[PDB]
RNA sequence: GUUCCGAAGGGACGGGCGAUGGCCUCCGUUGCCCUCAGCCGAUCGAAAGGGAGUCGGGUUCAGAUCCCCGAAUCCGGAGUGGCGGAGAUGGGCGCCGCGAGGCGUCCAGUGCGGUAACGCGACCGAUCCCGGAGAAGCCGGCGGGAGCCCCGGGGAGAGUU
RNA sequence: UAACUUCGGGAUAAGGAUUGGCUCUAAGGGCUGGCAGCCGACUUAGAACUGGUGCGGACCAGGGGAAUCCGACUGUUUAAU
């Protein structure tokens, strides 16, 4: 039962973003010419929003509920699949595989992930996806 | 041959009194007093026997002069625990929490049944 | 001691305020310009004689130049 | 049923297809070609929990062999140690139909 | 080739300390210098570090055991009896 | 007697109050209150243990890693930080502009690269917790790097003839 | 190369032969492109000749065997009988 499909929450087990949560936006089950191994384009979050409680000002809540995101290619060996699923409509034409040869495109893709991560987090679902892992 | 002497008032072959030979621009052979060989940090996991990588191996009080990038690596637990045990810790925490959720839901199901 | 491989950055170093003097060494196959700053001695090494002399004129006027042999 | 599962494994590895080892059984599970996974009783608890989680994700059966990796390997008929193995094609054996 | 008839590891003691003492120390010497198989990884990498302490070269796992053997019959019978006692206690 | 029968602390981020100086800005000195706070016991004990950081040439009658010259380096300090660089300077929409480019609204911005081990010159963060280095026996064998010795020739000067 | 033996020793047991100088021979390896070229470093074995039988020529350098008594052994002890 092939389960590594877009919308599948994963944990990054290696690299700079180790222990960070991410959601798959594209999977390549058979490696291309440049990457012989199977891999996946993923977009995750770097800095989780801080714990927000009542009795705080609206400015403080809005300032502490900010997300910084990342986008990267990973190995299935370096990814750990969970059982949760997050269905956030990332735009494919901006979040895609040719983005890594231009920093401006990379920044646009990161911003595009960030804005809708903010939107869903403020809606308040996928709280497991948005609260950090305690390891 | 030219056989030479110490340069300090310590005349015993102790740990601090270690020297090497060097030929000076005056065409002479002298002792220089070397520094004690430092060690890279050992992993905080307490299991891996090897040293950490990407961290300079110097005598501990020299680490004040180094910059931060030459002291750690860009990762969670960077420069304090090795990558293998980092990834096993991540996996262990996640799977343990999943098992805890499973046992909680089974307990709730049993409470409903009873 | 530091070795400067470029020319205009060496010129900047010469115009620095801590520069006390510049000394010119003329040895076979080579020309060396040594600026004495506060912390380091900066050496610019060049192998062309007319480049060396035009740099010598291009050196700042208010800094003590001393050729040595 | 240890004798009968030894017989089935001998037949499976005579005829069908299999992979021996954790880092390759994981690849087979992720590709979904793994029909059955078998784990020795002395494999590390962390990785056996990992394999169980992967099998639950991929809807695959897991069997806890009743011997450690040395005689799991000898039951495989290999002269080394295997902790986890994956049957990909049962072949002419009723290992899946236990 | 076979270099000795009776004495094995105790060939290093020469003609000293007596035949009976050498014989009764030979088996303990063999037992304490043997390599045992690890019950945790299956490799034969169990060495006695110090008296009562056994170490695996691959697992990096340390076990408390006998002075000259990896485990003693007293230890194994105590373990079995304690298991049976717990089984009876919880019925 | 040395933690044993002690009310064994005179410290601190921050918050509040009260005064002061300095362009009363903002901070500092403080004075009071709130809040936080285990130490294993004062103190002594190594010119061979632990312990950051200096080397080369010259110089006397007798002193040199100490004097002179030349190259360095560590620690501490610095209101105004003395300067520079990083943070950090972007995107959308709407106008004007043939365009280049510029004006208005919004919104983001506690850094990036690599599959990875890791890398880049920086790259916020307190009480608290965790770990490492300091920090180690004796013997054997092997390998690498030096210094000395050895060998084959070029010079310069001396001996024999 | 013996008695004996705690089978480890005894053991260099005991007892014999050889050893100089010179001229040769054979074997023992690298690098480059079953072959070829270019480089080597020390050793071992054998042979001919030769000296007033002399050769580990100075220095260095275990006498041995057969038994008895005592203490198993290594170790320590009355600085000045
Ligand atoms: Mg000392
Ligand atoms: Mg580093
Ligand atoms: Mg003291
Ligand atoms: Mg001292
Ligand atoms: Mg005798
Ligand atoms: Mg008698
Ligand atoms: Mg005696
Ligand atoms: Mg006496
Ligand atoms: Zn480790
Ligand atoms: Zn083991």
From Swiss-Prot, chain A:
Keywords: Acetylation, Cytoplasm, Endoplasmic reticulum, Ribonucleoprotein, Ribosomal protein
UniProt GO BP: translation
Protein name: Large ribosomal subunit protein eL27
GO cellular component: cytosolic large ribosomal subunit; rough endoplasmic reticulum; synapse
InterPro entries (alphabetical): KOW, Ribosomal_eL27, Ribosomal_eL27_CS, Ribosomal_eL27_KOW, Ribosomal_eL27_sf, Translation_prot_SH3-like_sf
Reported function: Component of the large ribosomal subunit. Required for proper rRNA processing and maturation of 28S and 5.8S rRNAs.
Organism of this sequence: Oryctolagus cuniculus
Pfam families in alphabetical order: KOW (PF00467), Ribosomal_L27e (PF01777)
A GO molecular-function annotation: structural constituent of ribosome
Primary location class: cytoplasm
Primary gene name: RPL27
The keyword RNA-binding belongs to this UniProt entry's keyword annotation: no
N6-acetyllysine sites (modified residues): 26, 92
Keyword Hydrolase: no
Curated annotation (Swiss-Prot), chain B:
Keyword entries, A-Z: Acetylation, Cytoplasm, Endoplasmic reticulum, Isopeptide bond, Phosphoprotein, Ribonucleoprotein, Ribosomal protein, Ubl conjugation
GO cellular component: cytosol; endoplasmic reticulum; ribonucleoprotein complex; ribosome
N6-acetyllysine PTM positions: 35, 42
Subcellular localization(s) per the UniProt record: Cytoplasm, Cytosol; Cytoplasm; Endoplasmic reticulum
Positions bearing the Glycyl lysine isopeptide (Lys-Gly) (interchain with G-Cter in SUMO2) cross-link: 107
The organism's place on the tree of life at top rank: Eukaryota
Protein task: Component of the large ribosomal subunit. The ribosome is a large ribonucleoprotein complex responsible for the synthesis of proteins in the cell.
Protein name: Large ribosomal subunit protein eL34
Protein source organism: Oryctolagus cuniculus
From Swiss-Prot, chain D:
Modified-residue entries (N6-acetyllysine), positions: 17
Cellular component terms (Gene Ontology): cytosolic large ribosomal subunit; nucleus; postsynaptic density
Biological processes annotated in GO: antimicrobial humoral immune response mediated by antimicrobial peptide; cytoplasmic translation; defense response to Gram-negative bacterium; killing of cells of another organism
Keywords: Acetylation, Cytoplasm, Isopeptide bond, Phosphoprotein, Ribonucleoprotein, Ribosomal protein, Ubl conjugation
UniProt crosslink position (Glycyl lysine isopeptide (Lys-Gly) (interchain with G-Cter in SUMO2)): 17
Pfam families documented for this protein: Ribosomal_L7Ae (PF01248)
Stored SUPFAM superfamilies: L30e-like (SSF55315)
PTM annotation (Phosphoserine): residues: 1, 7
UniProt-listed Gene3D superfamilies: 3.30.1330.30
Protein localization: Cytoplasm
PROSITE patterns named among the record's database cross-references: RIBOSOMAL_L30E_1, RIBOSOMAL_L30E_2
Role description: Component of the large ribosomal subunit. The ribosome is a large ribonucleoprotein complex responsible for the synthesis of proteins in the cell.
Protein name: Large ribosomal subunit protein eL30
Organism: Oryctolagus cuniculus (Rabbit)
Gene: RPL30
Curated annotation (Swiss-Prot), chain E:
GO MF annotation list: large ribosomal subunit rRNA binding; structural constituent of ribosome; zinc ion binding
Keyword Zinc-finger: yes
One GO BP annotation of this record: translation
InterPro entries xref list: Ribosomal_eL37/eL43 (IPR011331), Ribosomal_eL43 (IPR002674), Ribosomal_zn-bd (IPR011332)
Cell compartments where the protein resides: Cytoplasm
UniProt xrefs under Gene3D superfamilies: 2.20.25.30
Gene Ontology CC terms: cytosolic large ribosomal subunit
A Pfam family hit: Ribosomal_L37ae
SUPFAM superfamilies linked: Zn-binding ribosomal proteins
Keywords, sorted A to Z: Cytoplasm, Metal-binding, Ribonucleoprotein, Ribosomal protein, Zinc, Zinc-finger
Domain of life: Eukaryota
Residue positions binding Zn(2+): 38, 41, 56, 59
Residue intervals of every C4-type zinc finger in the record: 38-59
Stated family: Belongs to the eukaryotic ribosomal protein eL43 family.
Subunit details: Component of the large ribosomal subunit.
UniProt-listed HAMAP family: Ribosomal_eL43
Function summary: Component of the large ribosomal subunit. The ribosome is a large ribonucleoprotein complex responsible for the synthesis of proteins in the cell.
Name of the molecule in the record: Large ribosomal subunit protein eL43
Organism lineage: Eukaryota, Metazoa, Chordata, Craniata, Vertebrata
């Amino acid at each position: 039962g092939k389960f590594m499909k877009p919308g599948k929450v994963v944990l990054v087990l290696a690299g700079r973003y180790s222990g960070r949560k991410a959601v798959i936006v594209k999977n390549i089950d058979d490696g291309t010419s440049d990457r012989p191994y199977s891999h996946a384009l993923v977009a995750g979050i770097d800095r989780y929003p801080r714990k927000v409680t009542a009795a705080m000002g609206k400015k403080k809540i809005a300032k502490r509920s900010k997300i910084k995101s990342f986008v990267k290619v990973y190995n299935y060996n370096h990814l750990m699949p969970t059982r949760y699923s997050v269905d956030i409509p990332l735009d494919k034409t901006v979040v895609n595989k040719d983005v890594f040869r231009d920093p401006a495109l990379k920044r646009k893709a990161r911003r595009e992930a960030k804005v809708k991560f903010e939107e869903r987090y403020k809606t308040g679902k996928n709280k497991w996806f948005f609260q950090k892992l305690r390891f | 041959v030219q056989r030479l002497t110490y340069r300090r008032r310590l005349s015993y072959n102790t740990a601090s009194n270690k020297t090497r030979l060097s030929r000076t621009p005056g065409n002479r052979i002298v002792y220089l007093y070397t520094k004690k060989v430092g060690k890279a940090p050992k992993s905080a996991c307490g299991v891996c026997p090897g040293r950490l990588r990407g961290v300079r191996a110097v005598r501990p009080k020299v680490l004040m002069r180094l910059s931060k990038t030459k002291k750690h690596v860009s990762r969670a637990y960077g420069g304090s625990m090795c990558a293998k045990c980092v990834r096993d810790r991540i996996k262990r925490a996640f799977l343990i929490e999943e098992q805890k959720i499973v046992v909680k839901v089974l307990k709730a199901q049993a409470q409903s049944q009873k | 001691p530091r070795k400067i491989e470029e020319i205009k950055d060496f010129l900047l170093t010469a115009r620095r305020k801590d520069a006390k003097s510049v000394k010119i060494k003329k040895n076979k196959d080579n020309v060396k310009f040594k600026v004495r700053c506060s912390r380091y001695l900066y050496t610019l090494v060049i192998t062309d004689k007319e480049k060396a002399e035009k740099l010598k004129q291009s050196l700042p006027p208010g800094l003590a130049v001393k050729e040595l042999k | 049923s240890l004798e009968s599962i030894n017989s089935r494994l001998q037949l499976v590895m005579k005829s069908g297809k299999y992979v021996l080892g954790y880092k390759q059984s994981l690849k087979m599970i992720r590709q979904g070609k793994a029909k059955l996974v078998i784990l020795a009783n002395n494999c590390p608890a962390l990785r056996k929990s990992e394999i169980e989680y992967y099998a639950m994700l991929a809807k695959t059966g897991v069997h806890h062999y009743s011997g450690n990796n040395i005689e799991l390997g000898t039951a495989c008929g290999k002269y080394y140690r295997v902790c986890t193995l994956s049957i990909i094609d049962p072949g002419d054996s009723d290992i899946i139909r236990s | 080739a076979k270099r000795t008839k009776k004495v094995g590891i105790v060939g290093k003691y020469g003609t000293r300390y007596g035949a009976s003492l050498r014989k009764m120390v030979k088996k303990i010497e063999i037992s304490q210098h043997a390599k045992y198989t690890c019950s945790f990884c299956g490799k034969t990498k169990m060495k006695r570090r110090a008296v009562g302490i056994w170490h695996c070269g691959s697992c990096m796992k340390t076990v408390a055991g006998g002075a000259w053997t990896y485990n003693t019959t007293s230890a194994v019978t105590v373990k079995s009896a304690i298991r049976r006692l717990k089984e009876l206690k919880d019925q």
